[PDB]
Every structure is written in C-alpha cells, then in structure tokens.
Short mmCIF file of all heavy atoms in Angstrom, two decimals:
data_model
loop_
_atom_site.label_atom_id
_atom_site.label_comp_id
_atom_site.label_asym_id
_atom_site.label_seq_id
_atom_site.Cartn_x
_atom_site.Cartn_y
_atom_site.Cartn_z
N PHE D 1 0.84 -1.20 0.02
CA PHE D 1 0.08 0.03 -0.04
C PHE D 1 0.92 1.26 0.00
O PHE D 1 0.41 2.29 -0.55
CB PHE D 1 -0.93 0.03 1.21
CG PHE D 1 -1.72 1.22 1.24
CD1 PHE D 1 -3.06 1.27 0.60
CD2 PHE D 1 -1.40 2.32 2.06
CE1 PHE D 1 -3.81 2.32 0.60
CE2 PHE D 1 -2.34 3.36 2.19
CZ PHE D 1 -3.56 3.32 1.41
N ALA D 2 2.04 1.23 0.56
CA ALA D 2 2.89 2.44 0.66
C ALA D 2 3.51 2.77 -0.70
O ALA D 2 3.50 3.95 -1.23
CB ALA D 2 4.08 2.17 1.48
N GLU D 3 3.68 1.77 -1.53
CA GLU D 3 4.26 2.00 -2.94
C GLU D 3 3.13 2.10 -3.99
O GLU D 3 3.44 2.40 -5.09
CB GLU D 3 5.18 0.91 -3.34
CG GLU D 3 6.39 0.85 -2.52
CD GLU D 3 7.46 -0.17 -3.15
OE1 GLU D 3 7.15 -0.72 -4.30
OE2 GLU D 3 8.37 -0.49 -2.52
N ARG D 4 1.84 2.07 -3.57
CA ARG D 4 0.78 2.28 -4.51
C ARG D 4 0.02 3.59 -4.35
O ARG D 4 -0.42 4.06 -5.22
CB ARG D 4 -0.27 1.03 -4.22
CG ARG D 4 0.10 -0.17 -4.79
CD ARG D 4 -1.06 -1.17 -4.94
NE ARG D 4 -1.58 -1.39 -3.50
CZ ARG D 4 -1.33 -2.63 -2.94
NH1 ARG D 4 -0.71 -3.45 -3.39
NH2 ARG D 4 -1.95 -2.75 -1.68
N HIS D 5 0.02 4.19 -3.14
CA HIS D 5 -0.57 5.47 -2.88
C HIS D 5 0.36 6.45 -2.35
O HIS D 5 -0.05 7.54 -1.83
CB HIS D 5 -1.71 5.28 -1.83
CG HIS D 5 -2.66 4.31 -2.38
ND1 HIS D 5 -2.41 2.84 -2.43
CD2 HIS D 5 -4.06 4.37 -2.65
CE1 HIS D 5 -3.45 2.26 -2.84
NE2 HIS D 5 -4.37 3.06 -3.06
N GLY D 6 1.68 6.19 -2.33
CA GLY D 6 2.64 7.22 -1.78
C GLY D 6 4.04 6.77 -2.08
O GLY D 6 4.36 6.26 -3.15
N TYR D 7 4.91 7.04 -0.95
CA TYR D 7 6.43 6.62 -1.10
C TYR D 7 6.83 6.30 0.33
O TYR D 7 6.17 6.62 1.31
CB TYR D 7 7.27 7.69 -1.73
CG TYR D 7 7.20 8.98 -0.91
CD1 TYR D 7 8.14 9.26 0.08
CD2 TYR D 7 6.23 9.90 -1.29
CE1 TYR D 7 8.15 10.39 0.60
CE2 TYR D 7 6.26 11.12 -0.56
CZ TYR D 7 7.27 11.39 0.49
OH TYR D 7 7.20 12.54 1.12
N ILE D 8 7.91 5.33 0.24
CA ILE D 8 8.39 4.90 1.55
C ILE D 8 9.95 5.39 1.59
O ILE D 8 10.60 5.30 0.51
CB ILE D 8 8.38 3.33 1.84
CG1 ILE D 8 8.78 3.05 3.15
CG2 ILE D 8 8.99 2.64 0.67
CD1 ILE D 8 8.76 1.55 3.53
N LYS D 9 10.40 5.76 2.72
CA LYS D 9 11.69 6.41 2.78
C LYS D 9 12.75 5.16 3.19
O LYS D 9 12.42 4.40 4.10
CB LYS D 9 11.69 7.42 3.92
CG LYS D 9 13.16 8.18 3.97
CD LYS D 9 13.08 9.17 4.98
CE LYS D 9 14.26 10.11 4.99
NZ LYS D 9 14.29 11.21 5.99
N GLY D 10 13.81 5.07 2.70
CA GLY D 10 14.78 4.08 2.88
C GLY D 10 16.30 4.72 2.86
O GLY D 10 16.57 5.61 2.09
N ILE D 11 17.07 4.06 3.67
CA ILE D 11 18.45 4.42 3.84
C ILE D 11 19.39 3.46 3.32
O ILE D 11 19.31 2.22 3.57
CB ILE D 11 18.76 4.83 5.28
CG1 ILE D 11 20.16 5.10 5.47
CG2 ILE D 11 18.37 3.60 6.17
CD1 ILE D 11 20.63 6.53 5.04
N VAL D 12 20.38 3.84 2.54
CA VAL D 12 21.33 3.10 2.07
C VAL D 12 22.43 2.71 3.02
O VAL D 12 23.24 3.57 3.38
CB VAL D 12 22.01 3.69 0.64
CG1 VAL D 12 22.88 2.50 0.02
CG2 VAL D 12 20.95 4.03 -0.26
N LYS D 13 22.61 1.45 3.53
CA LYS D 13 23.47 1.07 4.55
C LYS D 13 24.92 0.80 3.99
O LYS D 13 25.95 1.22 4.66
CB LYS D 13 22.91 -0.01 5.34
CG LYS D 13 21.76 0.35 6.30
CD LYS D 13 22.16 1.48 7.06
CE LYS D 13 20.97 1.69 8.19
NZ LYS D 13 20.82 0.71 9.09
N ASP D 14 25.00 -0.01 2.94
CA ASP D 14 26.27 -0.50 2.45
C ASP D 14 26.13 -0.92 0.92
O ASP D 14 25.04 -1.36 0.62
CB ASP D 14 26.84 -1.62 3.28
CG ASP D 14 28.26 -1.82 2.95
OD1 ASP D 14 28.94 -1.09 2.21
OD2 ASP D 14 28.73 -2.95 3.38
N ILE D 15 27.31 -0.74 0.19
CA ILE D 15 27.23 -1.13 -1.13
C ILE D 15 28.32 -2.25 -1.24
O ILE D 15 29.47 -2.09 -1.18
CB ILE D 15 27.61 0.04 -2.01
CG1 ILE D 15 26.63 1.20 -1.97
CG2 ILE D 15 27.81 -0.38 -3.53
CD1 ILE D 15 26.92 2.39 -2.83
N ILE D 16 27.75 -3.56 -1.45
CA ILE D 16 28.59 -4.75 -1.43
C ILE D 16 28.85 -5.21 -2.77
O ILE D 16 28.22 -4.86 -3.68
CB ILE D 16 27.94 -5.80 -0.53
CG1 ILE D 16 26.48 -6.00 -0.96
CG2 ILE D 16 27.97 -5.30 0.97
CD1 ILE D 16 25.77 -7.04 -0.21
N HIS D 17 29.88 -6.06 -2.86
CA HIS D 17 30.26 -6.78 -4.11
C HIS D 17 29.64 -8.12 -4.08
O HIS D 17 30.20 -8.97 -3.28
CB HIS D 17 31.76 -6.67 -4.36
CG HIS D 17 32.36 -7.62 -5.36
ND1 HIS D 17 32.67 -8.97 -5.26
CD2 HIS D 17 32.40 -7.41 -6.71
CE1 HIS D 17 33.05 -9.52 -6.31
NE2 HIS D 17 32.87 -8.60 -7.36
N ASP D 18 28.77 -8.46 -4.97
CA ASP D 18 28.24 -9.73 -5.20
C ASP D 18 29.10 -10.69 -6.01
O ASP D 18 29.30 -10.36 -7.16
CB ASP D 18 26.84 -9.62 -5.75
CG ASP D 18 26.14 -11.02 -5.72
OD1 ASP D 18 26.64 -11.99 -4.94
OD2 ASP D 18 25.09 -11.12 -6.32
N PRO D 19 29.81 -11.69 -5.41
CA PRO D 19 30.53 -12.59 -6.27
C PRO D 19 29.84 -13.32 -7.31
O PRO D 19 29.05 -14.18 -7.04
CB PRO D 19 31.12 -13.62 -5.23
CG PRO D 19 31.05 -12.89 -3.96
CD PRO D 19 29.75 -12.19 -3.95
N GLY D 20 30.10 -13.01 -8.55
CA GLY D 20 29.45 -13.69 -9.66
C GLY D 20 28.97 -12.65 -10.64
O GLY D 20 28.67 -13.00 -11.95
N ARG D 21 28.78 -11.37 -10.37
CA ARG D 21 28.25 -10.32 -11.32
C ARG D 21 29.14 -9.23 -11.06
O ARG D 21 29.96 -9.01 -10.19
CB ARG D 21 26.82 -9.98 -11.03
CG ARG D 21 26.65 -9.16 -9.60
CD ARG D 21 25.13 -8.67 -9.46
NE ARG D 21 24.31 -9.92 -9.29
CZ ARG D 21 22.98 -9.78 -9.19
NH1 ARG D 21 22.43 -8.67 -9.25
NH2 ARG D 21 22.33 -10.97 -8.94
N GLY D 22 29.11 -8.34 -12.07
CA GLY D 22 29.95 -7.08 -12.24
C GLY D 22 29.24 -5.85 -11.70
O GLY D 22 29.74 -4.67 -11.98
N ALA D 23 27.99 -5.91 -11.21
CA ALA D 23 27.15 -4.80 -10.68
C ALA D 23 27.16 -4.90 -9.26
O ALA D 23 26.80 -5.99 -8.69
CB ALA D 23 25.82 -4.66 -11.37
N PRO D 24 27.39 -3.87 -8.49
CA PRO D 24 27.27 -3.94 -7.06
C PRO D 24 25.84 -3.96 -6.61
O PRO D 24 24.94 -3.54 -7.28
CB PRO D 24 28.12 -2.61 -6.54
CG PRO D 24 28.00 -1.61 -7.77
CD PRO D 24 27.98 -2.48 -8.96
N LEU D 25 25.73 -4.39 -5.29
CA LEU D 25 24.44 -4.47 -4.76
C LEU D 25 24.42 -3.42 -3.47
O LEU D 25 25.36 -3.36 -2.76
CB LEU D 25 24.08 -5.79 -4.30
CG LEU D 25 24.10 -6.84 -5.41
CD1 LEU D 25 23.51 -8.26 -4.89
CD2 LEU D 25 23.26 -6.37 -6.62
N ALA D 26 23.25 -2.74 -3.26
CA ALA D 26 22.96 -1.92 -2.22
C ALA D 26 22.01 -2.37 -1.17
O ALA D 26 21.01 -2.93 -1.58
CB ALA D 26 22.55 -0.49 -2.67
N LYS D 27 22.49 -2.27 0.16
CA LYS D 27 21.55 -2.86 1.24
C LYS D 27 20.73 -1.69 1.70
O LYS D 27 21.20 -1.05 2.74
CB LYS D 27 22.37 -3.63 2.26
CG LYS D 27 23.20 -4.76 1.82
CD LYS D 27 23.79 -5.50 2.97
CE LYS D 27 24.68 -4.60 3.75
NZ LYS D 27 25.29 -5.32 4.96
N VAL D 28 19.61 -1.49 1.06
CA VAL D 28 18.75 -0.23 1.53
C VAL D 28 17.92 -0.83 2.70
O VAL D 28 17.25 -1.79 2.58
CB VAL D 28 18.06 0.20 0.40
CG1 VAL D 28 17.31 1.53 0.71
CG2 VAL D 28 18.78 0.23 -0.79
N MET D 29 17.84 -0.07 3.76
CA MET D 29 17.06 -0.55 5.03
C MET D 29 15.85 0.31 5.07
O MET D 29 16.09 1.58 5.45
CB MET D 29 18.05 -0.40 6.26
CG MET D 29 17.14 -0.60 7.46
SD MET D 29 18.27 -0.81 9.04
CE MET D 29 19.12 -2.32 8.49
N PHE D 30 14.77 -0.22 4.92
CA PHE D 30 13.44 0.51 4.86
C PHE D 30 12.80 0.21 6.33
O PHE D 30 13.40 -0.68 7.09
CB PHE D 30 12.40 0.26 3.90
CG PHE D 30 12.90 0.48 2.47
CD1 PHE D 30 13.76 -0.50 1.78
CD2 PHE D 30 12.58 1.64 1.83
CE1 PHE D 30 14.16 -0.10 0.55
CE2 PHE D 30 13.04 1.93 0.73
CZ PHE D 30 13.79 1.07 -0.06
N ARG D 31 11.77 0.87 6.64
CA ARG D 31 11.10 0.75 7.97
C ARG D 31 9.71 0.19 7.76
O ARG D 31 8.87 0.63 6.96
CB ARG D 31 10.91 2.10 8.66
CG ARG D 31 10.51 2.13 10.03
CD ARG D 31 10.38 3.50 10.66
NE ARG D 31 9.28 4.22 9.94
CZ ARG D 31 8.05 4.44 10.62
NH1 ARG D 31 7.74 3.92 11.66
NH2 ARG D 31 7.20 5.09 9.81
#
C-alpha cells in the first residue's frame, strides 16, 4: 500500500560486491 498510494523512505547502509556479477548491490534498509 505504501508504494501504491505514496512513497516509503529508505536509507542505503552499504554497497557490497556480489561474487558472480559485475554490478554492485546496495543494502537499503526501509522501515
């Protein structure tokens, strides 16, 4: 419901390297 009628705030905690792909992954922590 948050992503259908508004927006939710999230904080980027860390940008990690996923072994196997060439694009990093971000650990965004929502509430």
